[PDB]
């Protein structure tokens, strides 16, 4: 059978284009469908922005309390929006960007690497000395992703972010209490229960972080373990540039796609 067909197929039903990325390991052969094709972060690359403020600071920098107003609360922005009055520390941004998809904590991260484009330079850099030549931030989050397909901004593709997120959660591009941490956060996202994670038996042990936007974009990125204990790096990512700029994303779809990647896995 091919793997590509039933792929395919979950297009035609739900009249999308999918993207999947699984990289190759010890024991299995890589995953790839649309793999270089670009498609918007959306909220995916607030987890390698975790990480880059994780590599450039001591952990200490964890407790520095960042101050806000509510003239800074943009786009959706669960936790920082509860916070303006108390500020936040940079560890409380890292949670709340990755955990709750937070736009605010992510600016205000952004803003903790520094420089022109609101930090946006400075993180698309970190992706570069990951060996990341594909992937680009270009502009702060002031709303979910609906710019046109068109717009190369603010784009990865599966292969490219699948291999960012192999480095920073399995391999050493963290030191191991870095690494820990966004390993963590991800490990209790709260926005990701419909996608990978319902594609994957409930004996797998699943950590990630979600994208959403216009144009039905739909992603998520994570990492997985199997029963006994194996790790695999899923990303899956999903539009319909054909519906128009508010065409409905579909979080089942990547859940059956993970659940045509877990059977493979399996």
């Given at each position: 059978?091919?793997?590509?067909?039933?792929?395919?197929?979950?297009?035609?039903?739900?009249?999308?284009?999918?993207?999947?990325?699984?990289?190759?390991?010890?024991?299995?052969?890589?995953?790839?469908?649309?793999?270089?094709?670009?498609?918007?972060?959306?909220?995916?690359?607030?987890?390698?922005?975790?990480?880059?403020?994780?590599?450039?600071?001591?952990?200490?920098?964890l407790?520095?309390?960042?101050?806000?107003?509510?003239?800074?609360?943009?786009?959706?922005?669960?936790?920082?929006?509860?916070?303006?009055?108390t500020?936040?520390?940079?560890?409380?941004?890292?949670?709340?960007?990755?955990?709750?998809?937070?736009?605010?904590?992510?600016?205000?991260?952004?803003?903790?690497?520094?420089?022109?484009?609101?930090?946006?330079?400075?993180?698309?850099?970190?992706?570069?000395?990951?060996?990341?030549?594909?992937?680009r931030?270009?502009?702060?989050?002031?709303?979910?992703?609906?710019?046109?397909?068109?717009?190369?901004?603010?784009?990865?593709?599966?292969?490219?972010i699948?291999?960012?997120?192999?480095?920073?959660?399995?391999?050493?591009?963290?030191?191991?209490?870095?690494?820990?941490?966004?390993?963590?956060?991800?490990?209790?996202?709260?926005?990701?229960?419909?996608?990978?994670?319902?594609?994957?038996?409930?004996?797998?042990?699943?950590?990630?972080?979600?994208?959403?936007?216009?144009?039905?974009?739909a992603?998520?990125?994570?990492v997985?373990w199997?029963?006994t204990?194996?790790?695999?790096?899923?990303?899956?990512?999903?539009?319909?540039?054909?519906?128009?700029?508010?065409?409905?994303?579909?979080?089942?779809?990547?859940?059956?796609?993970?659940?045509?990647?877990?059977?493979?896995?399996?």
């Open positions: 059978a091919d793997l590509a067909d039933r792929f395919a197929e979950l297009e035609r039903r739900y009249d999308a284009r999918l993207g999947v990325y699984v990289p190759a390991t010890g024991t299995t052969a890589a995953i790839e469908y649309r793999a270089d094709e670009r498609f918007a972060f959306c909220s995916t690359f607030k987890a390698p922005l975790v990480a880059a403020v994780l590599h450039q600071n001591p952990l200490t920098h407790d520095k309390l960042i101050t806000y107003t509510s003239d800074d609360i943009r786009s959706i922005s669960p936790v920082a929006q509860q916070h303006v009055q500020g936040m520390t940079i560890g409380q941004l890292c949670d709340a960007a990755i955990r709750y998809s937070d736009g605010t904590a992510a600016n205000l991260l952004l803003a903790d690497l520094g420089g022109p484009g609101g930090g946006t330079a400075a993180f698309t850099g970190y992706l570069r000395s990951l060996g990341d030549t594909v992937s931030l270009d502009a702060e989050e002031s709303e979910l992703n609906r710019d046109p397909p068109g717009d190369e901004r603010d784009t990865t593709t599966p292969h490219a699948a291999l960012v997120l192999q480095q920073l959660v399995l391999g050493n591009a963290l030191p191991p209490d870095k690494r820990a941490l966004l390993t963590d956060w991800m490990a209790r996202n709260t926005t990701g229960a419909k996608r990978i994670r319902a594609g994957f038996p409930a004996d797998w042990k699943v950590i990630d972080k979600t994208g959403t936007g216009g144009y039905g974009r992603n998520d990125i994570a997985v199997s029963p204990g194996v790790p695999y790096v899923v990303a899956v990512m999903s539009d319909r540039a054909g519906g128009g700029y508010d065409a409905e994303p579909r979080e089942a779809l990547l859940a059956e796609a993970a659940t045509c990647v877990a059977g493979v896995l399996a």
